CSV table of C-alpha atoms in Angstrom, one decimal:
chain,number,residue,atom,x,y,z
A,16,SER,CA,25.7,25.1,18.2
A,17,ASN,CA,27.4,27.7,17.0
A,18,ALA,CA,27.0,26.3,13.6
A,19,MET,CA,25.4,28.6,10.8
A,20,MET,CA,23.9,25.5,9.3
A,21,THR,CA,20.9,22.8,11.4
A,22,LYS,CA,20.6,19.4,11.7
A,23,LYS,CA,17.1,19.7,9.1
A,24,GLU,CA,19.5,21.2,6.6
A,25,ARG,CA,22.6,18.8,7.2
A,26,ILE,CA,20.2,15.8,6.5
A,27,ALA,CA,18.5,17.2,3.5
A,28,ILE,CA,22.0,17.7,1.6
A,29,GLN,CA,22.6,14.4,2.9
A,30,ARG,CA,19.7,12.9,1.3
A,31,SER,CA,20.5,15.1,-1.5
A,32,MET,CA,23.9,13.5,-1.7
A,33,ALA,CA,22.3,9.8,-1.2
A,34,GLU,CA,20.2,10.5,-4.7
A,35,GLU,CA,23.8,11.3,-6.8
A,36,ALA,CA,25.3,7.7,-5.0
A,37,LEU,CA,22.2,5.5,-5.8
A,38,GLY,CA,22.3,7.5,-9.2
A,39,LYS,CA,25.9,6.4,-10.4
A,40,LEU,CA,25.3,2.4,-9.1
A,41,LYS,CA,21.8,2.4,-11.3
A,42,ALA,CA,24.4,4.0,-14.3
A,43,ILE,CA,26.7,1.1,-13.2
A,44,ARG,CA,23.6,-1.3,-13.5
A,45,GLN,CA,23.1,0.3,-17.2
A,46,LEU,CA,26.6,-1.2,-18.8
A,47,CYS,CA,25.9,-4.8,-17.5
A,48,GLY,CA,26.2,-6.6,-21.1
A,49,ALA,CA,27.2,-3.7,-22.9
A,50,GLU,CA,30.3,-5.6,-24.1
A,51,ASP,CA,27.6,-7.8,-26.1
A,52,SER,CA,25.8,-7.1,-29.2
A,53,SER,CA,23.6,-9.9,-28.5
A,54,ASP,CA,20.2,-9.9,-27.0
A,55,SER,CA,18.4,-11.6,-23.1
A,56,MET,CA,19.5,-10.9,-17.0
A,57,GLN,CA,20.8,-12.7,-13.8
A,58,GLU,CA,23.7,-9.9,-14.0
A,59,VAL,CA,21.5,-6.9,-13.8
A,60,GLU,CA,19.2,-9.0,-11.5
A,61,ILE,CA,22.1,-9.1,-8.7
A,62,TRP,CA,22.5,-5.0,-9.2
A,63,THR,CA,19.0,-4.2,-9.0
A,64,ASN,CA,18.3,-6.0,-5.5
A,65,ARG,CA,21.4,-4.4,-4.4
A,66,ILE,CA,20.6,-1.2,-4.9
A,67,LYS,CA,17.0,-2.2,-3.6
A,68,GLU,CA,18.6,-2.8,-0.5
A,69,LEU,CA,20.6,0.6,-0.2
A,70,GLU,CA,17.9,2.3,-1.0
A,71,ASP,CA,15.5,0.9,1.2
A,72,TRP,CA,18.0,1.5,3.9
A,73,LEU,CA,18.9,5.0,2.9
A,74,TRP,CA,15.1,6.0,3.2
A,75,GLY,CA,13.6,3.6,5.6
A,76,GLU,CA,16.2,3.1,7.9
A,77,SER,CA,19.2,5.1,8.4
A,78,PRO,CA,20.3,8.0,10.2
A,79,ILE,CA,18.6,9.9,7.0
A,80,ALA,CA,15.6,8.2,6.6
B,123,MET,CA,32.9,3.7,-33.8
B,124,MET,CA,31.2,2.1,-30.8
B,125,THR,CA,28.4,-0.1,-32.0
B,126,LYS,CA,24.9,1.9,-31.8
B,127,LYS,CA,24.0,-0.7,-29.0
B,128,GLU,CA,27.1,0.2,-26.6
B,129,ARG,CA,26.5,3.8,-27.4
B,130,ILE,CA,23.2,3.6,-25.9
B,131,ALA,CA,24.3,1.7,-23.2
B,132,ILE,CA,26.6,4.7,-22.2
B,133,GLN,CA,23.7,7.1,-22.8
B,134,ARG,CA,21.2,5.0,-20.4
B,135,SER,CA,24.6,4.9,-17.7
B,136,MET,CA,24.5,8.6,-17.7
B,137,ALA,CA,20.8,9.1,-18.2
B,138,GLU,CA,20.6,7.3,-14.4
B,139,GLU,CA,23.2,10.5,-13.7
B,140,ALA,CA,20.6,13.0,-14.7
B,141,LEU,CA,18.0,11.6,-13.1
B,142,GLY,CA,20.4,11.4,-9.6
B,143,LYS,CA,20.7,15.1,-9.9
B,144,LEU,CA,17.5,16.0,-10.5
B,145,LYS,CA,16.5,13.7,-7.5
B,146,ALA,CA,18.8,15.5,-5.4
B,147,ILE,CA,17.3,18.7,-6.5
B,148,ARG,CA,13.8,17.8,-4.9
B,149,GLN,CA,15.5,16.5,-1.9
B,150,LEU,CA,16.4,20.4,-0.4
B,151,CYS,CA,12.9,21.6,-0.7
B,152,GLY,CA,12.0,23.0,2.3
B,153,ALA,CA,15.6,22.5,3.9
B,154,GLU,CA,15.3,26.4,5.3
B,155,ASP,CA,11.7,25.5,7.0
B,156,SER,CA,3.4,25.3,-1.2
B,157,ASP,CA,6.1,22.9,1.2
B,158,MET,CA,4.9,19.3,0.4
B,159,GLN,CA,3.4,20.6,-2.8
B,160,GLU,CA,6.7,21.5,-3.9
B,161,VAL,CA,8.7,18.3,-3.8
B,162,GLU,CA,5.0,16.7,-5.6
B,163,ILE,CA,6.2,18.9,-8.0
B,164,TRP,CA,9.2,17.6,-8.5
B,165,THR,CA,7.9,13.8,-7.9
B,166,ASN,CA,5.5,14.5,-11.1
B,167,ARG,CA,8.6,15.6,-13.0
B,168,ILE,CA,11.1,13.4,-12.7
B,169,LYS,CA,8.7,10.5,-12.8
B,170,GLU,CA,7.5,11.7,-16.1
B,171,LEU,CA,11.0,12.2,-17.4
B,172,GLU,CA,12.0,9.0,-16.4
B,173,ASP,CA,8.9,7.4,-17.6
B,174,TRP,CA,9.9,9.0,-21.2
B,175,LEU,CA,13.6,7.8,-20.9
B,176,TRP,CA,12.5,4.2,-20.2
B,177,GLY,CA,9.5,4.0,-22.0
B,178,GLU,CA,9.2,6.2,-24.9
B,179,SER,CA,13.2,7.9,-25.6
B,180,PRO,CA,15.5,6.8,-28.3
B,181,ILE,CA,17.3,4.9,-25.4
B,182,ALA,CA,14.1,3.1,-24.2
C,276,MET,CA,22.3,28.5,7.2
C,277,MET,CA,20.2,28.9,4.2
C,278,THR,CA,16.9,31.4,3.3
C,279,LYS,CA,14.5,30.4,0.9
C,280,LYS,CA,15.9,32.3,-1.7
C,281,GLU,CA,19.6,30.7,-1.5
C,282,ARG,CA,18.4,27.8,-1.3
C,283,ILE,CA,16.2,28.0,-4.6
C,284,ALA,CA,19.3,29.4,-5.9
C,285,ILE,CA,21.3,26.3,-5.0
C,286,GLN,CA,18.5,24.2,-7.0
C,287,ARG,CA,18.9,26.5,-9.8
C,288,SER,CA,22.4,26.1,-9.9
C,289,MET,CA,21.9,22.0,-10.0
C,290,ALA,CA,19.1,22.4,-12.3
C,291,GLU,CA,22.5,23.7,-15.1
C,292,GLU,CA,24.2,20.9,-14.3
C,293,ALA,CA,21.4,18.0,-14.7
C,294,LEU,CA,20.8,20.0,-18.1
C,295,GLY,CA,24.4,19.8,-19.2
C,296,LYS,CA,24.2,15.8,-18.2
C,297,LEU,CA,21.5,15.3,-20.4
C,298,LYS,CA,23.1,17.8,-23.5
C,299,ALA,CA,25.8,15.4,-22.9
C,300,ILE,CA,23.4,12.7,-23.8
C,301,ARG,CA,22.5,14.4,-27.1
C,302,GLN,CA,25.8,14.6,-27.8
C,303,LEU,CA,26.4,10.7,-28.0
C,304,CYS,CA,23.7,9.8,-31.1
C,305,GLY,CA,26.2,8.9,-33.6
C,306,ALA,CA,27.0,5.0,-34.2
C,307,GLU,CA,29.0,2.6,-36.7
C,308,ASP,CA,26.2,1.0,-37.5
C,309,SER,CA,23.4,3.3,-37.5
C,310,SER,CA,22.2,5.6,-40.4
C,311,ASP,CA,23.2,8.9,-40.1
C,312,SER,CA,19.2,10.2,-40.7
C,313,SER,CA,18.3,8.1,-37.7
C,314,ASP,CA,20.9,9.7,-35.4
C,315,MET,CA,20.2,12.9,-36.3
C,316,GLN,CA,16.6,12.2,-35.3
C,317,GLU,CA,18.1,10.8,-32.4
C,318,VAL,CA,19.1,14.1,-31.7
C,319,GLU,CA,16.4,16.4,-32.6
C,320,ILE,CA,14.2,14.6,-30.3
C,321,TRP,CA,16.4,14.9,-27.6
C,322,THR,CA,16.7,18.4,-27.9
C,323,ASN,CA,13.0,19.3,-27.9
C,324,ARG,CA,12.7,17.0,-24.5
C,325,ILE,CA,15.3,18.5,-23.4
C,326,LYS,CA,14.2,21.9,-24.3
C,327,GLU,CA,10.8,21.1,-22.9
C,328,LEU,CA,12.4,20.7,-19.9
C,329,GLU,CA,14.4,23.9,-19.6
C,330,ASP,CA,11.3,25.9,-20.7
C,331,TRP,CA,9.4,23.9,-17.7
C,332,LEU,CA,12.1,24.4,-15.0
C,333,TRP,CA,13.0,28.2,-15.9
C,334,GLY,CA,9.1,28.8,-16.7
C,335,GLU,CA,6.8,27.1,-14.5
C,336,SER,CA,8.8,25.1,-12.2
C,337,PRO,CA,8.8,25.6,-8.4
C,338,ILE,CA,12.6,27.5,-8.9
C,339,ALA,CA,11.5,29.8,-11.7
D,212,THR,CA,-25.4,22.3,22.1
D,213,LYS,CA,-23.4,23.3,19.1
D,214,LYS,CA,-20.0,22.6,21.3
D,215,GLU,CA,-21.1,18.9,20.8
D,216,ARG,CA,-22.3,18.6,17.8
D,217,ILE,CA,-19.1,20.0,17.0
D,218,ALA,CA,-17.2,17.4,18.6
D,219,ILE,CA,-19.6,14.8,17.3
D,220,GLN,CA,-18.5,16.0,13.9
D,221,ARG,CA,-15.0,16.3,15.0
D,222,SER,CA,-15.3,12.3,15.8
D,223,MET,CA,-17.2,11.8,12.3
D,224,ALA,CA,-13.9,13.3,10.7
D,225,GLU,CA,-11.7,11.1,12.9
D,226,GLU,CA,-13.1,8.3,10.4
D,227,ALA,CA,-13.6,9.7,7.3
D,228,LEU,CA,-10.2,10.5,7.4
D,229,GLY,CA,-9.5,6.9,8.2
D,230,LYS,CA,-11.2,5.8,5.1
D,231,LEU,CA,-9.2,7.9,2.9
D,232,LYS,CA,-6.0,6.1,4.8
D,233,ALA,CA,-7.3,3.0,4.1
D,234,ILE,CA,-7.2,3.8,0.2
D,235,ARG,CA,-3.7,4.7,0.7
D,236,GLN,CA,-2.8,1.5,2.2
D,237,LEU,CA,-4.0,-0.4,-1.1
D,238,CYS,CA,-1.6,1.7,-3.4
D,239,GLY,CA,0.6,-0.8,-5.2
D,240,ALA,CA,-1.4,-3.9,-4.0
D,241,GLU,CA,-1.0,-5.6,-7.2
D,242,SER,CA,7.8,4.1,-7.9
D,243,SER,CA,4.9,4.8,-10.1
D,244,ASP,CA,3.3,3.0,-6.0
D,245,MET,CA,5.8,5.8,-4.5
D,246,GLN,CA,4.0,8.6,-6.4
D,247,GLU,CA,1.0,7.5,-5.8
D,248,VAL,CA,1.6,6.9,-2.0
D,249,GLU,CA,2.6,10.7,-1.9
D,250,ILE,CA,0.0,12.3,-3.8
D,251,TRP,CA,-2.5,10.6,-1.3
D,252,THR,CA,-0.4,11.4,1.9
D,253,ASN,CA,-0.5,15.1,0.9
D,254,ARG,CA,-4.1,15.0,-0.2
D,255,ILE,CA,-4.9,13.6,3.4
D,256,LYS,CA,-2.5,15.9,5.2
D,257,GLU,CA,-4.1,18.4,3.7
D,258,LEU,CA,-7.7,17.8,4.8
D,259,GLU,CA,-6.3,16.9,8.2
D,260,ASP,CA,-4.8,20.7,8.2
D,261,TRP,CA,-7.8,22.0,6.6
D,262,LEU,CA,-10.2,20.2,9.5
D,263,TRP,CA,-8.3,20.9,12.5
D,264,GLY,CA,-7.4,24.5,11.3
D,265,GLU,CA,-9.5,26.3,9.0
D,266,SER,CA,-13.0,24.5,8.7
D,267,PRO,CA,-16.2,25.0,10.8
D,268,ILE,CA,-15.0,22.4,13.1
D,269,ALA,CA,-11.4,23.6,13.6
E,272,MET,CA,-7.2,-15.5,-4.8
E,273,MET,CA,-5.0,-13.2,-2.9
E,274,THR,CA,-1.5,-13.4,-2.7
E,275,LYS,CA,-0.3,-12.8,1.1
E,276,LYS,CA,1.2,-9.1,0.4
E,277,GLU,CA,-2.4,-8.4,-0.7
E,278,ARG,CA,-4.1,-10.1,2.2
E,279,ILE,CA,-1.7,-8.0,3.8
E,280,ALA,CA,-2.3,-4.1,2.3
E,281,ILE,CA,-6.2,-5.3,2.9
E,282,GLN,CA,-5.7,-5.9,6.5
E,283,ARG,CA,-3.3,-2.3,7.0
E,284,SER,CA,-6.5,-0.8,5.2
E,285,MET,CA,-8.4,-2.0,7.7
E,286,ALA,CA,-5.9,-1.0,10.7
E,287,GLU,CA,-6.1,2.8,9.6
E,288,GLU,CA,-10.2,2.4,9.9
E,289,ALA,CA,-9.7,1.3,13.6
E,290,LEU,CA,-7.4,3.5,14.1
E,291,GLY,CA,-9.8,6.7,13.2
E,292,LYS,CA,-12.6,5.1,15.4
E,293,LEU,CA,-10.2,5.3,18.1
E,294,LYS,CA,-9.3,8.9,17.3
E,295,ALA,CA,-12.9,9.3,16.7
E,296,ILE,CA,-13.3,8.6,20.4
E,297,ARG,CA,-10.8,10.6,21.3
E,298,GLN,CA,-12.3,13.7,19.7
E,299,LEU,CA,-15.6,13.0,22.6
E,300,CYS,CA,-13.6,13.7,25.5
E,301,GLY,CA,-14.7,16.9,27.6
E,302,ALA,CA,-17.5,17.3,24.8
E,303,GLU,CA,-20.3,17.4,27.9
E,304,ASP,CA,-18.7,20.2,29.7
E,305,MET,CA,-7.4,17.7,28.7
E,306,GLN,CA,-4.8,15.1,31.5
E,307,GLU,CA,-8.1,12.5,29.6
E,308,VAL,CA,-7.3,13.8,25.9
E,309,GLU,CA,-3.7,12.9,26.6
E,310,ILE,CA,-3.7,9.5,27.4
E,311,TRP,CA,-5.7,9.0,24.6
E,312,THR,CA,-3.5,10.2,22.3
E,313,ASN,CA,0.0,8.3,24.0
E,314,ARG,CA,-2.1,4.6,24.1
E,315,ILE,CA,-3.0,5.7,20.4
E,316,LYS,CA,0.8,6.5,19.9
E,317,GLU,CA,1.6,3.0,21.1
E,318,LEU,CA,-1.3,1.4,19.3
E,319,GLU,CA,-0.1,3.0,16.0
E,320,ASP,CA,3.6,2.7,16.5
E,321,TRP,CA,3.1,-1.0,17.1
E,322,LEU,CA,1.4,-1.8,14.0
E,323,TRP,CA,3.3,-0.3,11.6
E,324,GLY,CA,6.9,-0.5,13.3
E,325,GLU,CA,6.0,-4.1,15.2
E,326,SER,CA,3.2,-6.1,13.9
E,327,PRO,CA,2.5,-9.0,11.2
E,328,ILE,CA,1.4,-5.8,8.7
E,329,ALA,CA,4.3,-3.7,9.5
F,294,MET,CA,-27.0,19.1,27.8
F,295,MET,CA,-25.0,16.0,27.4
F,296,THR,CA,-23.9,14.3,30.6
F,297,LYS,CA,-20.2,12.7,31.2
F,298,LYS,CA,-21.6,9.4,32.0
F,299,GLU,CA,-23.8,9.2,28.3
F,300,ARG,CA,-20.5,11.0,26.7
F,301,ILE,CA,-18.4,8.0,28.1
F,302,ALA,CA,-21.5,5.5,27.6
F,303,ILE,CA,-20.7,6.6,23.6
F,304,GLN,CA,-16.9,6.0,24.1
F,305,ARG,CA,-17.3,2.7,24.9
F,306,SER,CA,-19.8,2.0,22.4
F,307,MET,CA,-17.4,3.2,19.9
F,308,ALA,CA,-14.6,1.2,21.7
F,309,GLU,CA,-16.8,-1.9,21.3
F,310,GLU,CA,-16.4,-1.3,17.3
F,311,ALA,CA,-12.5,-0.3,16.9
F,312,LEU,CA,-11.9,-4.2,19.1
F,313,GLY,CA,-14.8,-5.7,16.3
F,314,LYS,CA,-12.3,-4.0,13.6
F,315,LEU,CA,-9.1,-5.1,15.0
F,316,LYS,CA,-10.5,-9.4,15.3
F,317,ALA,CA,-12.0,-8.6,11.9
F,318,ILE,CA,-8.3,-7.7,10.8
F,319,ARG,CA,-7.4,-10.9,12.9
F,320,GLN,CA,-10.0,-13.1,11.0
F,321,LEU,CA,-7.9,-12.8,7.8
F,322,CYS,CA,-4.8,-14.4,8.8
F,323,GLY,CA,-3.4,-17.2,6.8
F,324,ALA,CA,-7.0,-16.1,4.4
F,325,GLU,CA,-4.7,-17.1,1.7
F,326,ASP,CA,-2.2,-20.0,0.1
F,327,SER,CA,-0.6,-20.5,3.8
F,328,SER,CA,0.8,-22.8,5.9
F,329,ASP,CA,-1.0,-23.8,9.6
F,330,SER,CA,2.4,-22.4,11.8
F,331,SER,CA,2.6,-19.4,9.5
F,332,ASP,CA,-0.5,-18.3,10.2
F,333,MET,CA,-0.7,-19.6,13.6
F,334,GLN,CA,2.2,-17.7,15.0
F,335,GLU,CA,0.4,-14.2,13.0
F,336,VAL,CA,-2.6,-14.9,15.1
F,337,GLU,CA,-1.6,-15.4,18.4
F,338,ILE,CA,0.3,-11.9,18.2
F,339,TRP,CA,-2.9,-10.1,16.8
F,340,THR,CA,-5.0,-12.2,19.5
F,341,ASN,CA,-2.4,-11.3,22.9
F,342,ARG,CA,-2.2,-7.1,21.4
F,343,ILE,CA,-6.3,-7.2,21.0
F,344,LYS,CA,-6.1,-8.8,24.4
F,345,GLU,CA,-3.8,-6.2,26.1
F,346,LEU,CA,-5.9,-3.5,24.0
F,347,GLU,CA,-9.1,-4.7,25.5
F,348,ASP,CA,-7.9,-5.0,28.7
F,349,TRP,CA,-6.7,-1.2,28.9
F,350,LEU,CA,-10.2,-0.4,27.7
F,351,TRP,CA,-11.8,-2.0,30.4
F,352,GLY,CA,-9.7,-2.2,33.6
F,353,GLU,CA,-7.4,0.8,33.1
F,354,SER,CA,-8.8,3.2,30.8
F,355,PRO,CA,-10.6,6.2,31.3
F,356,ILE,CA,-13.5,4.6,30.1
F,357,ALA,CA,-13.2,1.8,32.7
G,284,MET,CA,-5.4,-8.5,-8.3
G,285,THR,CA,-5.4,-6.6,-11.0
G,286,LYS,CA,-4.3,-2.8,-10.7
G,287,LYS,CA,-7.9,-1.9,-12.5
G,288,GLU,CA,-9.1,-4.0,-9.5
G,289,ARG,CA,-7.4,-2.1,-7.2
G,290,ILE,CA,-8.4,1.1,-8.8
G,291,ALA,CA,-11.8,-0.5,-8.7
G,292,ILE,CA,-11.9,-0.9,-4.8
G,293,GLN,CA,-9.7,2.2,-4.1
G,294,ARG,CA,-13.2,4.1,-5.8
G,295,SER,CA,-15.7,2.7,-4.0
G,296,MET,CA,-13.6,3.1,-0.8
G,297,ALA,CA,-13.8,6.6,-2.0
G,298,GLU,CA,-17.1,6.8,-2.2
G,299,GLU,CA,-17.8,5.9,1.3
G,300,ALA,CA,-15.1,8.6,2.4
G,301,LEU,CA,-17.0,11.5,0.5
G,302,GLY,CA,-20.2,9.7,2.2
G,303,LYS,CA,-19.1,10.4,5.8
G,304,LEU,CA,-17.9,13.7,5.0
G,305,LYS,CA,-21.6,14.9,3.1
G,306,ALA,CA,-22.9,13.0,6.7
G,307,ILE,CA,-20.8,16.0,8.7
G,308,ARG,CA,-22.5,18.4,6.7
G,309,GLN,CA,-25.5,17.3,7.5
G,310,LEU,CA,-25.2,18.4,11.1
G,311,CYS,CA,-24.6,21.9,10.9
G,312,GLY,CA,-27.0,24.4,11.7
G,313,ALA,CA,-28.9,21.1,13.8
G,314,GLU,CA,-29.8,23.3,16.2
G,315,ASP,CA,-33.4,25.8,16.3
G,316,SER,CA,-30.6,28.6,16.8
G,317,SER,CA,-29.7,28.1,13.6
G,318,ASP,CA,-28.7,31.1,11.1
G,319,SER,CA,-27.3,32.5,7.9
G,320,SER,CA,-23.6,31.6,9.9
G,321,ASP,CA,-25.0,27.8,9.8
G,322,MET,CA,-25.9,27.5,6.3
G,323,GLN,CA,-22.4,29.4,5.3
G,324,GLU,CA,-20.7,26.5,7.4
G,325,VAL,CA,-23.1,24.0,5.4
G,326,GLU,CA,-21.8,26.2,2.0
G,327,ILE,CA,-17.6,25.8,3.2
G,328,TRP,CA,-18.3,22.1,3.8
G,329,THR,CA,-19.9,21.5,0.3
G,330,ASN,CA,-17.0,23.4,-0.8
G,331,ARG,CA,-14.5,21.5,0.3
G,332,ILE,CA,-15.9,18.1,-0.6
G,333,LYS,CA,-16.6,19.6,-4.3
G,334,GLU,CA,-12.8,20.5,-4.3
G,335,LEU,CA,-11.8,16.8,-3.1
G,336,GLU,CA,-14.9,15.0,-5.1
G,337,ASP,CA,-13.6,16.9,-8.2
G,338,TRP,CA,-9.7,15.9,-7.8
G,339,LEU,CA,-10.9,12.5,-7.1
G,340,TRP,CA,-12.6,12.0,-10.5
G,341,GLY,CA,-11.0,14.5,-12.3
G,342,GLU,CA,-6.7,14.2,-11.3
G,343,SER,CA,-5.7,11.7,-9.2
G,344,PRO,CA,-4.2,8.6,-9.2
G,345,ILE,CA,-7.8,6.8,-9.2
G,346,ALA,CA,-9.6,9.1,-11.9
H,263,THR,CA,17.9,-48.4,3.9
H,264,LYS,CA,18.9,-44.3,3.5
H,265,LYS,CA,15.6,-44.1,3.1
H,266,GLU,CA,14.8,-46.0,6.8
H,267,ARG,CA,17.5,-44.0,8.3
H,268,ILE,CA,15.6,-40.7,7.4
H,269,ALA,CA,12.6,-42.0,8.8
H,270,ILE,CA,13.4,-42.9,11.7
H,271,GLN,CA,15.6,-39.7,12.1
H,272,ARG,CA,11.9,-37.7,11.1
H,273,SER,CA,10.2,-39.7,13.9
H,274,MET,CA,12.7,-38.6,16.3
H,275,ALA,CA,12.4,-35.0,15.3
H,276,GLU,CA,8.6,-34.9,15.9
H,277,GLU,CA,9.5,-35.9,19.7
H,278,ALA,CA,12.2,-33.3,19.4
H,279,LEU,CA,9.4,-30.3,18.3
H,280,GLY,CA,6.8,-31.6,21.3
H,281,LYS,CA,9.2,-31.3,23.9
H,282,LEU,CA,10.2,-27.8,22.7
H,283,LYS,CA,6.4,-26.9,22.2
H,284,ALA,CA,5.8,-28.7,25.9
H,285,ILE,CA,8.6,-25.8,27.2
H,286,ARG,CA,6.5,-22.9,25.4
H,287,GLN,CA,3.1,-24.4,27.3
H,288,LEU,CA,4.9,-23.4,31.2
H,289,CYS,CA,5.5,-19.8,29.8
H,290,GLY,CA,3.4,-17.3,32.2
H,291,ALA,CA,2.3,-20.4,34.4
H,292,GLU,CA,3.3,-19.2,37.5
H,293,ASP,CA,0.9,-15.9,36.9
H,294,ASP,CA,4.2,-11.7,29.4
H,295,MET,CA,2.8,-12.4,26.2
H,296,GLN,CA,6.5,-11.4,23.9
H,297,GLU,CA,7.8,-14.1,25.9
H,298,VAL,CA,5.4,-17.1,24.6
H,299,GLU,CA,5.7,-15.4,20.9
H,300,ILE,CA,9.3,-15.7,21.2
H,301,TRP,CA,9.0,-19.7,21.4
H,302,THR,CA,6.2,-19.6,19.1
H,303,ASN,CA,9.1,-17.7,16.6
H,304,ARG,CA,11.5,-20.6,17.2
H,305,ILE,CA,9.9,-23.2,17.3
H,306,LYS,CA,8.6,-22.2,14.2
H,307,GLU,CA,12.0,-21.7,12.6
H,308,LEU,CA,13.3,-24.9,14.1
H,309,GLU,CA,10.3,-26.9,12.4
H,310,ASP,CA,9.8,-24.8,8.8
H,311,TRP,CA,14.0,-26.0,8.8
H,312,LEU,CA,13.3,-29.4,9.7
H,313,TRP,CA,10.5,-30.1,6.9
H,314,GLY,CA,12.0,-27.4,4.6
H,315,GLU,CA,15.7,-26.7,4.3
H,316,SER,CA,17.1,-30.1,6.4
H,317,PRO,CA,19.1,-33.2,5.6
H,318,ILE,CA,15.6,-35.2,6.2
H,319,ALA,CA,13.2,-32.7,4.6
């Protein structure tokens, strides 16, 4: 290739961006029930599980694993 | 004007983004290749911060 | 595409953005229904923890 | 011969490495799990690199 | 006493020790005196890929 | 000093121990609270894969 | 199991790993043509094993 | 009477499972252990559904 960047570099950059993506999704989860002055988890759990699933895919199975 | 509890949720949301950026940093180690110890140093420091955030900090 | 120097420079650049985000958090410690002193103590706690991280980053870390 | 004694020492080192890797598999049996796993991975790879690269049996 | 996940972690620990023993065998090739080494390498890798990729403990 | 025949006998002895270890793993399937069919599915898979290895070791491998 | 139990089990396994490494060391210079070079090998093994053992019991996840 | 009808259905399910198991037993007769394991897995899946999630569980 006549490209400056290597495949290893491109994948590292992608993995770096994936951490930011995951940070954003986890940020979302933190607002569950922020409208509720009271205490209590089912909504939170749904997010936890979907994020874990994406995170397992990213680092286990994806093109950047 | 927000309640403290609302402000803390916002702060926690933002803390996830801060953690994301640190974790992004870590992924760049050796991209151009201490190799694995460099990465381990970041793991250990990010974990210490995450542990503080969710366990000891004002937003725990 | 990157030397190690360049990659480290890029990591240092990202570290400033991470620090910005943590300092942004510290600016939201005030609230309606909490005491000013309690919120002020939060600010002090954040400040000390951010300074500890900055000191590590620029002093002791792999990117110092 | 020193060579045959060295092969035997290398065979033994593989078994020591197996026992260390066995310890790694028990992490989290009961994030920190991933920190622990990474630390064992690295210590083990460091020992392997020493055994086969630097040690008297390299 | 054990959950299935704990039992599987124990089995994975044990599989590292079995791999260690096979790798130990490989190290004795030519100890008395290379395609032979390659045969072991390839067959160990096949087993290791199965264990961690496809087996009941993967 | 060591002959090739002796080296091969040593490798064969070690192979028996490796097989013993994989057979020991097989025995733990369903050790926990488990349904007889889950157990038996796992046991079959271990049995067949161990048998395949044994066949290779004693029939096709450098130590056969 | 508890984390304490799992850690105990890992420490017990570490002792066996250390035993196997130390066993290796005993075979250096087994030949009757052994000299200062063989003793140096022994020391090189001793030092590496001590580094690992100090890590295990001082700094590791199982310390 | 629904209970009786379900009992008869469960009785028949055992015969259906037996016939599938009968099929599995012919694998490799003419001599691939993966073929047998595929059958094991698919029979288990069905048996688990029958006694665990199905209308006759």
